[PDB]
Antibody, heavy 215, light 213 residues
Framework: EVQLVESGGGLVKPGGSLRLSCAAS????????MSWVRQAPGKGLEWVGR??????????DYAAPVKGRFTISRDDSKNTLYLQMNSLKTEDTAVYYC?????WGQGTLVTVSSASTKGPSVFPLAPSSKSTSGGTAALGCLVKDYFPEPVTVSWNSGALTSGVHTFPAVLQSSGLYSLSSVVTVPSSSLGTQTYICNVNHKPSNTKVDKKVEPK | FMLTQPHSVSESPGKTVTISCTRS????????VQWYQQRPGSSPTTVIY?????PSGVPDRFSGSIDSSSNSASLTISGLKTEDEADYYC?????????FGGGTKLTVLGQPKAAPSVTLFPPSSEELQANKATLVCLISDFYPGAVTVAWKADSSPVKAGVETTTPSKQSNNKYAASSYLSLTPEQWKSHRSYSCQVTHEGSTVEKTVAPTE
């Protein structure tokens, strides 16, 4: 019966504002203490703040990373909790949950990034004897500093698919993405076979074909 | 205060695990302790509250306890089911705060465990000649999907310039991950070696590269 409908939130430059709202049903919201909790991608739960019921004074508490910057209020006539996010930092990027912390909403995503469209830099990860275990050599391509997702990587125009492993991108503190694609091949074909990675970054209309050669 | 949990826990269906949660400052009995279950892509569920209480709809396989001896709260799950595979967070109240544990990844084993394969690439000379330097550490084929990655410059732990992905499930149902260390060309050449250290189920694979090899 309890419902917590989050809304608001999206992209925003650092230093901007965003208001989140949490609509509640199934419990007398006026008599309830409400909290905000956030979770950065791949990270843990971090308490943001709490407002207490207007019966108990209705004053607010805040975690240290959001003091002076975030404001929590409530319109318990409309059964709505608010999180006023000012002075946004990229470190605020997280899914934001409103809680009563027994019950949890589904969360809204807030992404704070100064990044804009940028094609990747592609560098070869050349096979050496320090890439070779057994008779198998590892070679790849480093796909550096692009935005936004996604990037597609094929090898030899898709004719080489065995032993190919493209790794999910890391999201860097700079707001740009980096990505690696590696392929394992017989070391005996480094002298006989040409290896080229094809990196396609459609958001920037960029495609890069990088030849990867033995050291 | 902080609440410290083990990074990950794993066991087979039907067996029993326990996740601990140690309070750093102040008494653990001082304040109520709650436990939340978080499945992939899902909002958290309260599974234990007020130290040992189960909300309605939570099976008695889930049990919570307190040990003043080690200033620890613990969550225990008997007869593990597939649906128990999730991340588990403890949390308690402070003199006016709200503290969450770091979280614990619980894997319900559905295939044999598998050690990570680690391949470390030095900076390409193409990148070095563009005044950049990135060390690429590729980790794949490990199960359960829970690793910690550390870096070393010679023998010293690297404290900045490290970006690491969370584990991603590959098509063979094992997991992959990536760590990157950014340097300038001067830093790269001024050290005898750099190391990527991958810890998986209490054991570590270290790969080293050197500007001279």
């Amino acid at each position: 019966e309890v419902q917590l409908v989050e809304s608001g939130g999206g992209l925003v430059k650092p230093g901007g504002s965003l208001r989140l709202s949490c609509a509640a049903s199934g419990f007398t919201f006026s008599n309830a203490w409400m909290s905000w909790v956030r979770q950065a991608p791949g990270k843990g739960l971090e308490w943001v703040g709490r407002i207490k019921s207007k019966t108990d004074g209705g004053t607010t508490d805040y975690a240290a990373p959001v003091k002076g910057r975030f404001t929590i209020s409530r319109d318990d006539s409309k059964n709505t909790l608010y999180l006023q996010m000012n002075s946004l930092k990229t470190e605020d990027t997280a899914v934001y949950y409103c809680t009563t912390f027994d019950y949890w909403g589904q969360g809204t995503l807030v992404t704070v990034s100064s990044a804009s469209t940028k094609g990747p830099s592609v560098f070869p990860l050349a096979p050496s004897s320090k890439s070779t275990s057994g008779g198998t050599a590892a070679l790849g391509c480093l796909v550096k500093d692009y935005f936004p997702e996604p990037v597609t990587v094929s090898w030899n125009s898709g004719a080489l698919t065995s032993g190919v492993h493209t790794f999910p991108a890391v999201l860097q503190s700079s707001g740009l993405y980096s990505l690696s694609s590696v392929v394992t091949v017989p070391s005996s074909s480094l002298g006989t076979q040409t290896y080229i990675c094809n990196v396609n970054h459609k958001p920037s209309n960029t495609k890069v074909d990088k030849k990867v050669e033995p050291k | 205060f902080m609440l410290t949990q083990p990074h990950s826990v794993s066991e087979s269906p039907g067996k029993t695990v326990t996740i601990s949660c140690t309070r750093s400052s102040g008494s653990i009995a001082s304040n109520y302790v709650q436990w939340y279950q978080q499945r992939p892509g899902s909002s958290p569920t309260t599974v234990i509250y007020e130290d040992n209480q189960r909300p309605s709809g939570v099976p008695d396989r889930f049990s919570g306890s307190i040990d003043s001896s080690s200033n620890s709260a613990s969550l225990t799950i008997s007869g593990l089911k597939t649906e128990d595979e999730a991340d588990y967070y403890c949390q308690s109240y402070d003199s006016s705060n709200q503290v969450f544990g770091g979280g614990t990844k619980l894997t319900v084993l559905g295939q044999p465990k598998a050690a990570p394969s680690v391949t470390l690439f030095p900076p390409s000379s193409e990148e070095l000649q563009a005044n950049k330097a990135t060390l690429v550490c590729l980790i794949s084929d490990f199960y359960p999907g829970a690793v910690t990655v550390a870096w070393k410059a010679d023998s010293s732990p690297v404290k900045a310039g490290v970006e690491t992905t969370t584990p991603s499930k590959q098509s063979n149902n094992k997991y992959a991950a990536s760590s990157y260390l950014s340097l300038t060309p001067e830093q790269w050449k001024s050290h005898r070696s750099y190391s990527c250290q991958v810890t998986h189920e209490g054991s570590t694979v270290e790969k080293t590269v050197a500007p001279t090899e």
